[PDB]
Amino acid sequence: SMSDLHIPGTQSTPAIQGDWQAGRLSMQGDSYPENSYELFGQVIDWVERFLADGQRPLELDLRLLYLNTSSIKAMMDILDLLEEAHQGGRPVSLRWHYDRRNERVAELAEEFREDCSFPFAIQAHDE
Template identity: 70%
Template sequence: MNDFSIPGSQSSPAIQSDWNNGVLSMQGDSYPENSYELFHQVFEWIERYLAEAARPLSLELRLLYLNTSSIKAVMDIFDLLEAAYQEGKHVAVNWYYDKRNERVVELAEEFKEDCTFPFMIVSHD
């Protein structure tokens, strides 16, 4: 399977996929000029993984700031995971945050409210 790695920049998160281990990770800020362009590859990879792999999928997030269009993209990703979870697939989100950044906790908690799949919000130093 084609894994991908998108290097992070000042305005976009680093994104890596790991098909063999069923992990998609994103870290950094997300306020790209074109969030559709940035997240299109992520959607396609998740859709393909959920359709073809008979293994759990885990999203490992270390996102710090998301602009409105990035929030919409992440909501769409969580909608994909929710649909898969309702079909009996094993999906989970682990959102890691720095204890000093309460804004991230609030954002993650807002996303979690709409999700029935396992969704952990984990602090780290």
């Protein structure tokens, strides 16, 4: 648990699991805190640390829903670190799951993916 990251979710912030040995970062829920960097600051640090050295792949598994503007900026900061490591030859990957009946989550995930050149999957589910 020492190198890991386990953050419980609330009504306005997502639940987050950083599995250091598996190289997996997972998030679920809505995200609309007033200061998203009080939440995402440690997630960005965790990603930067994972990506600074080594060659182990890092995959992001997202089940995020509504993100406010501050969370979208923080999310963009995370994807900028993925893209930088990917341009340097680091294998990174992202999967964004969403309920097929709500196309806004797929549309948001797609806007993020247009600024990324690493493997980025958007997967619809029949709830």
